[PDB]
Design a protein around this ligand. Sequence first.
Ligand code: FMN
Ligand code: SF4
Ligand code: SF4
Ligand code: SF4
Ligand code: FES
Ligand code: FES
Ligand code: K
Lengths: 213, 430, 43, 263
Amino acid sequence: ALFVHRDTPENNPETPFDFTPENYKRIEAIVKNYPEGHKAAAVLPVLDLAQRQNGWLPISAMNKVAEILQVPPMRVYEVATFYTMYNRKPVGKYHIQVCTTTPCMLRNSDSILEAIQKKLGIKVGETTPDKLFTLIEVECLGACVNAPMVQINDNYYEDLTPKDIEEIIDELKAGKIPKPGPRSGRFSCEPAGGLTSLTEPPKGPGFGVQAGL
Amino acid sequence: KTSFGSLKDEDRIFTNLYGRHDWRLKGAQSRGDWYKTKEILLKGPDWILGEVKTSGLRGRGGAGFPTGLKWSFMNKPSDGRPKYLVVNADEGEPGTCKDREIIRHDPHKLVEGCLVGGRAMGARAAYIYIRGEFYNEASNLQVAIREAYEAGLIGKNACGSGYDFDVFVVRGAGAYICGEETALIESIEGKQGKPRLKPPFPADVGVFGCPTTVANVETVAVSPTICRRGGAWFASFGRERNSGTKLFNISGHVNNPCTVEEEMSVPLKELIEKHAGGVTGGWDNLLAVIPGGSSTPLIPKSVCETVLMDFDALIQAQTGLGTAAVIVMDRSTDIVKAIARLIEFYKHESCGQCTPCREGVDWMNKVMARFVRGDARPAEIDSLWEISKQIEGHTICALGDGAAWPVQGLIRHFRPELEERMQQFAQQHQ
Amino acid sequence: FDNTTYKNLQHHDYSTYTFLDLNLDLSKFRMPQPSSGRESPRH
Amino acid sequence: SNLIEVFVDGQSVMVEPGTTVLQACEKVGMQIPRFCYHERLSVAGNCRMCLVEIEKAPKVVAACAMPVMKGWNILTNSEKTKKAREGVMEFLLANHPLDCPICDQGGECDLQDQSMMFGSDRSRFLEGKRAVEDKNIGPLVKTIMTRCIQCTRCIRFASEIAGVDDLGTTGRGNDMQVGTYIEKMFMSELSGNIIDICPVGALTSKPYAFTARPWETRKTESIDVMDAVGSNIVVSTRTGEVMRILPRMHEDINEEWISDKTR
Ligand SMILES: Cc1cc2nc3c(=O)[nH]c(=O)nc-3n(C[C@H](O)[C@H](O)[C@H](O)COP(=O)(O)O)c2cc1C
Ligand code: SF4
Ligand code: SF4
Ligand code: SF4
Ligand code: FES
Ligand code: FES
Ligand SMILES: [K+]
């Protein structure tokens, strides 16, 4: 939880890191989205790419991003510590992120967080000894109408009950990758028990278009 | 009109809101997207800004500025720098998930909106900034953008109009403050998401120090339709100065939490009951509502009986429309704790740049945590009110205001609850 | 005509690099970038 | 002819376009309170101590950054301006440590002096305070970072004046911290100048530590002989002993800086 770095045998400037040749190709595409002379705009996506390859960001990975884009390391350090999606210490294979802001809290996100801890045997902020799961609370994830919900890696699992999230975790242990989305019966954000709108077939091209076009 | 609501499907813009039709280009084209886009582009920026102005459209990101006037700031002769449209898809306000559905279910509405909107401003490219947690939505958008490029709808000679336009998706890395328009720009430039002071204004010095307009996903995604069906058609919905339709998120204590599109100025009670299945336990089980996302002050049940969901009506109720994120709390809710959790949210999201919010929001969080337990004295309530007024209006960005308003709403409408909790704690610890 | 099924199931197979693979594939279509005139603000 | 007319407390002044509100006030001899603003550094606008009321404008503007517009009346002493300063000072002191007796800044501290002049005279902060880890940046500059008020003066000086981007901020919100992130020494021939620009005792001179208080020193205005630039200096002495060396402003020579050898 600290915002100062101390060298350790497993995280120091001589920790091995380097982009793969395939990932170097992606960096060029990233760097070409921004005007020439403003390459520093690529720090966030390139730093995120380093995390996608390595799972997290050692100080060596940050130094490499600074080196490639030719920005001071401090400016990369500032970015890595500002945004909460960058992992500056190793996390588990499955980073379980439970939303606990008020809209999800109102719909009993507490029972979800409790169920995960009881099943995994860990506490919030901890990693399992087998290093398969890391559990943390997070702020609103932009899926409030589908609360309570969690994000595991890149996927949202929504409309959860303690039963739903235990099956999801059991699938992850089994190696199966569960499908994201609501587990209650609806497919997305539509009201449960049937659409109250958008039930009629949609109008086609040119419907209601004003005169002059 | 006197009564607003009961919007008909023909008049809905986001006709694939629930993803039950194809979201890719073929589906979007069959639903009326990308239609006569070339004709709209050849009418020129002044004509486009005319339709947006006539429509009475106002920013859907929360602040609600009149869009037509705001976008016209860019309609000025070039000085040498490129001009950019930045589309705000950060979507960070708790209770707000409306922009998420547009990006993944109606991505081509957003892409066309960027092209049409970007034409009005004379922009060369649009940067769509999407929050990093919306990974699958960003990929859906990226697929949709490839289709438009492959069809010649964007890029060189966009739609055959002779206008060159690019659409870039840049992902965030987890920060609610990066939804603030200038902090968004700072993030695109690769710095910490810290807002800039104004002036300069983005239309003069913006992303990469170039003229820029930041526009919300919903605001941009409706511009193609307004230009096709006319500003007069859009302006025919809602009250005067509160025109159009609006996406509503209803969450909290309702039977059927959902995202729905409804006319502006729809009564709040009708919205919760017609679409969200009503308040859990019945309308009489209602305690309070947060009408426009966590930043807007809460209103109690009595105010909710007749309040309309538009900009002017909710300002009369001492709150705001905000993002139209309706968070419902019933009588079983611990209101003080619910608001306390929101202050804890703002404490975690403050960028730390400026003193009143870096120090004050953290200060408000510690006081609220004691108010939850009643571990306080009544004199501290007016202290907390005064602390909030020292933050509001004194910060660089509106996050400081957004942290102080929820506190004021609690004190304004639930002061007796705060005092009962303090009175009860003293007895148990006397 | 069917309004009964979800039709956004493609993202069930997006992987770690899906987003940046698309960004690479889009690079050919982009217009040439503008230039500030110098390599960077420190040049 | 290019000048525009503004008013400072109702008194007219002609200023060049682009002049900030804070600069218009100093044309009539009024010094707006500040912490983050320094005239030789880029504008930051983060401390908010310079907030000032513009007549007929509901929102106080940041004087250090806001350009003055023609016909504005700046109310440097109104109730709205005074209340804005009192609140900002209250926020600055909420987490500040009770260190003045053991802090080298005491007696020449801008936080102390502006608290005396522009802040309230008591506290209503009933919580516990933040406490921050100290950072080691070399043998010359001692850091007591619980005293930092996050003004970013040191960051801007290092980047712009010394051309060394080794200082930044890490973290967010109330936990945001100024430093190097990694263990690094800020060793540059101009490094000692961050002691002078830091408004608080967060950055202090290690050699000078604990030896004297500002009120008891005698200032001798003199010249530096460590190089041929001829930097203007003040020699602080007490009871017949040289205690420290400070820069003396000279626009045409050293401005308000000196090198580490001179210092
Ligand atoms: C803390 C904070 C977070 C914000 N988040 C968003 C957001 O997620 N999406 C958005 O459109 N506007 C957000 N805004 C508002 C923007 O700063 C800006 O007003 C808006 O993008 C303007 O676009 P519009 O006129 O179309 O609404 C936020 C503002 C603040 C202060
Ligand atoms: S109000 Fe808060 S989030 Fe906004 S600039 Fe100030 S410290 Fe940053
Ligand atoms: S910096 Fe100033 S106010 Fe703070 S402890 Fe030192 S002398 Fe006191
Ligand atoms: S160390 Fe001093 S100069 Fe640097 S940010 Fe803190 S208070 Fe400002
Ligand atoms: S409050 Fe949990 S997704 Fe918004
Ligand atoms: S002196 Fe203006 S905000 Fe700091
Ligand atoms: K100092």
